[PDB]
Amino acid sequence: RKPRTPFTTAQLLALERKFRQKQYLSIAERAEFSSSLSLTETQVKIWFQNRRAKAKRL
DNA sequence: CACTAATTGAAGG
DNA sequence: TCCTTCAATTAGTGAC
């Protein structure tokens, strides 16, 4: 498997507000956004995926 | 347990 | 036959 990534409180604030701006990223956006935070595209993809789930639960 | 990152796996492209 | 999405699942950390 793979260890949980400990996102920073700052990465997490960015991810949250990016998600507040739009809950989906296009590929280019994601490529850009992940580089901006120094996280892998997969990390961001999965964080958005998981957050969309949480947001559906609520 | 709550929360959340990661896995898996189907349906759609 | 790579990749997205969602649904469900698995599992790490951490409160109670």
Method of elucidation: X-ray
- For position A58, which CATH number holds? 1.10.10.60
Quick check: A40 CB within 7 A of strand B? no
Contact indicator for A48, A16 with CB cutoff of 8 Å: no
Locate A1 and state its tokens: 């498997």
> Which residue type does A28 have?
A
Nearest nucleotide, C1' to the C-alpha of A45? Answer: C4
Q: How far is the CA of A42 from the C1' of C2 (A)?
A: 14
Q: What is the number of domains present in chain A? A: 1
Return the closest-CA partner of residue A47 out of A22, A21, A20, A15. Answer: A15
Indicate the angle between helix axes A41-57 and A9-21, nearest 10 degrees. Answer: 60
Query: How far apart are the C-alpha atoms of A54 and A58, rounded to whole Å?
Result: 7
Q: How far is the CA of A49 from the C1' of B1 (A)?
A: 23
List the alpha helices (DSSP H) in chain A: 9-21, 27-37, 41-57
Domain that holds residue A28: 1-58
By the 10 Å C-beta count (0-12 exposed, 13-18 middle, 19+ buried), A43 is classed as middle
Nearest residue to C10 (CA, C1')? A1
Contact indicator for A15, A44 with CB cutoff of 8 Å: yes
CA-to-CA separations, A57 to A12, A16, A31, A47, in angstroms, rounded = 19, 16, 27, 15
